[PDB]
Every structure is written in structure tokens, then in C-alpha cells.
């Protein structure tokens, strides 16, 4: 096993290549969950990304 520190890269998330990888920092792709929360509290819709 390997533990990852200060590494935010969404490639290291599919186990078909990296058999056993663990990290202590959320990846970049997880930021999308933050935008959803801001979208509903501020009453926003009709977005283009």
C-alpha cells in the first residue's frame, strides 16, 4: 500500500491501473460537489460550464 500526501490528481482514482492507492487530500474533481451547494443556497440555475 501507498499513502498519498498533498496530491490532488483525479487520474489516481480508477483501481484498474493503480491497484492500491490511498490519499489524505480530496481530489480536484470533488470540487464539483461544492458548486452544487452554492448553486442552491444562492438560488442559481441555467448554467454553462
Amino acid at each position: 500500500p501507498v499513502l498519498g500526501l498533498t496530491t490532488r490528481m483525479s487520474i489516481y482514482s480508477d483501481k484498474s491501473i493503480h491497484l492500491s492507492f490511498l490519499r489524505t487530500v480530496p481530489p480536484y474533481s470533488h470540487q464539483s460537489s461544492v458548486w452544487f451547494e452554492m448553486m442552491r443556497v444562492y438560488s442559481w440555475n441555467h448554467i454553462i460550464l
Binding site: D14, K15, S16, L19
Partner: protein
């Protein structure tokens, strides 16, 4: 299927290929089995086919 890597993508390809066909495939169900539960544990729900 089991929890071996690549199983998420494996079952996702069934629905796209089983839809929009004049033959009319019927899906009995999707089974998720874990070998670590026990030999006798699997037969409890595997028979529900």
C-alpha cells in the same frame, strides 16, 4: 458480479445494449456478491435467480 475492479463499467454496458431492441431482452436482475462474507452466506441470496 463481484467487487473486482472494472465491475462498475461492466454492468453499465448491459443497459445500453439491452434497450431499444425489437427482440425484447428481459433483465432478471443484477447481483452483487462479496466472496469475503462466507461460503454459506452467498447461497442465501444467490438462489434468488
Amino acid at each position: 458480479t463481484t467487487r473486482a475492479p472494472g465491475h462498475r463499467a461492466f454492468l453499465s454496458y448491459i443497459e445500453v445494449l439491452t434497450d431499444g431492441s425489437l427482440v425484447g431482452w428481459e433483465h432478471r436482475g443484477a447481483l452483487t456478491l462479496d466472496p469475503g462474507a462466507g461460503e454459506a452466506v452467498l447461497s442465501a441470496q444467490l438462489r434468488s435467480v
